[PDB]
Ligand binder design. Structure first.
Ligand SMILES: *[C@](O)(C(N)=O)[C@H](CC1CCC1)NC(=O)[C@@H]1[C@@H]2[C@H](CN1C(=O)[C@@H](NC(=O)NC(C)(C)C)C(C)(C)C)C2(C)C
Ligand SMILES: *[C@](O)(C(N)=O)[C@H](CC1CCC1)NC(=O)[C@@H]1[C@@H]2[C@H](CN1C(=O)[C@@H](NC(=O)NC(C)(C)C)C(C)(C)C)C2(C)C
Lengths: 298, 301
């Protein structure tokens, strides 16, 4: 038993981190096969005009102590692709995926091509992430592991005025309405990921925390009206279906758990805690709860 | 900016995890150089786990009784010895993925990363703190025994914990890598209970300094306290006493923020009195005690 914010083992990703330098700017690169991927602002606003001026030897790529030889450079959206002469012998089985809001992933925070730490994040509904990044972390990546396949879903580019972070998928497309420019940008008003709070309440019941349960049930229509009041994301029938396994395992119907969440929103915790928390936690998806409460390995 | 419960990158540890089988019991082993370390209760049978004579049980075992599997490769055991509650299996192959490492025994309040494993395979990584009552609040299921706790400050893996058992409250108990349990626990199914736990005061102060570093100031106040008066108050909330050593180690964060340790102590007294009043500190509605002063410096600057 126990429930922790658990990240995926980062070993397969640590083997891909390299240091990329262009001018005075040093950040991280992701070395998969013979290509190094990094944020295009390493060359810094006309990115195609700035990239044309660059030679292959302008890009200094260092994989630990070894200097890699750049033999080509292209731009894909906000990501720079540096072709190198050596295929990374530590390239894991991998794919590039674009994630939806509410989905979680592990972040391997790096500085100068060296991994410093790993933690869990969720793609907020406002398309920002609440990460932990300092100067030099750009190029740090977010990922999930399924079986033996690493799915890369995020690359860090910038920090917004509220201390939250913005970045892209591994094809260079930003998550949210952000741009890689020094123009006024702000994170929109955020909402709570309802399906994730329900998954976390199921994890609390699995771990023997039951004070919030009740005899009541509700409808998807009545609950969604209450969710709207509290800046909660709408709960769809797909969400209800995804919660099916946890509902069957605990004997608590999804709309029964909705009545508990509704009462929790209108009345608060009343000094009580759930899984060592005084807030309703929304960064554990239904899959994360199953993956943890079942001990799935990679 | 931002503040997260951040674990160390687990790659150097994943390369040391193996599966160890003896009889019907299967758990994890830590393969460093030519030795595999695992909990000694892997040699126990269900018929005898209240009062096992481990010395007597180990003398009956042959090298071929221990099945060690590193992924697909079966390792050959060529020796076996016991060091306290840890079994050391000498194997014929040195682990080519052995990192630079050392065994360290940690003090209560110290934090570490746990690499939770099942059948020699890593499932996940998370942060833990050695509670003042010498238990850890981990996340472990059946098959997680032998999973280890570690820190990777400056490219050397310091192993500090190995998982052995779950207590009735859902909390966990284990040993250092020399086999010595943390706390008054024993590897026997006799009635055991975790003592009353307390909050790690020096860690809550470190976390309030991290909130100030990240721009949070609502909880500060004009008041100050003596160390003695702060401790008289904090014991009434089941907080650990704050020693002069704790005040000294908070020195760097105090100088960085311009807030004296005893002024931050006054802020914590007020927070204990009033609660948060619907506010939050670093995305939390409780006072967080699993970030040490060193962790705050690591993650902030
Ligand atoms: C990374 O590229 C890096 N070197 O690690 C760097 C990290 C930030 C976090 C501390 C320094 N990111 C940037 O330099 C990034 C590049 C410019 C401006 N960047 C910022 O993150 C800035 N934010 C910002 O301009 N925010 C808006 C656009 C005003 C909302 C900082 C002020 C935080 C430096 C670009 C291309 C976005
Ligand atoms: C590991 O060895 C393993 N196989 O992974 C296992 C932990 C698993 C089994 C449930 C969690 N540990 C034990 O089996 C451990 C070994 C016996 C009994 N153990 C327990 O953790 C038990 N707790 C327990 O007896 N607690 C006290 C002593 C009553 C307070 C379980 C009831 C959880 C199995 C020993 C030698 C302590």
């Amino acid at each position: 038993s126990g429930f922790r914010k658990m990240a995926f083992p980062s070993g397969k990703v640590e083997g891909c981190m390299v240091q990329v330098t262009c001018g005075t700017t040093t950040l991280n690169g992701l070395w998969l096969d013979d290509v190094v991927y990094c944020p295009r602002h390493v060359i810094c606003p006309n990115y195609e005009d700035l990239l044309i001026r660059k030679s292959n030897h302008n890009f200094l790529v260092q994989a630990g102590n070894v200097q890699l030889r750049v033999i080509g450079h292209s731009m894909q959206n906000c990501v720079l692709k540096l072709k190198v002469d050596t295929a990374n012998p530590k390239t894991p089985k991998y794919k590039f995926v674009r994630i939806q809001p509410g989905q979680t992933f592990s972040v391997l925070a790096c500085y100068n091509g060296s991994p410093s730490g790993v933690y869990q994040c969720a793609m907020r509904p406002n398309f920002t992430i609440k990460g932990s990044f300092l100067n030099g972390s750009c190029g740090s990546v977010g990922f999930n592991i399924d079986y033996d396949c690493v799915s890369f879903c995020y690359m860090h580019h910038m920090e917004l005025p509220t201390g939250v972070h913005a970045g892209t998928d591994l094809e260079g497309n930003f998550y949210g309405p952000f741009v890689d420019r020094q123009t006024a940008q702000a994170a929109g008003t955020d909402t709570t990921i309802t399906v994730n709070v329900l998954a976390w309440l199921y994890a609390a019941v699995i771990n023997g925390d039951r004070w919030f349960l009740n005899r009541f049930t509700t409808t998807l229509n009545d609950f969604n009206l209450v969710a709207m009041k509290y800046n909660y994301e709408p709960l769809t029938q797909d969400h209800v279906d995804i919660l099916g396994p946890l509902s069957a395992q605990t004997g608590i119907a999804v709309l029964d758990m909705c009545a508990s969440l509704k009462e929790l929103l209108q009345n608060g915790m009343n000094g009580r805690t759930i899984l060592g928390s005084a807030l309703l936690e929304d960064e554990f998806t239904p899959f994360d709860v199953v993956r943890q409460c079942s001990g799935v390995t990679f």
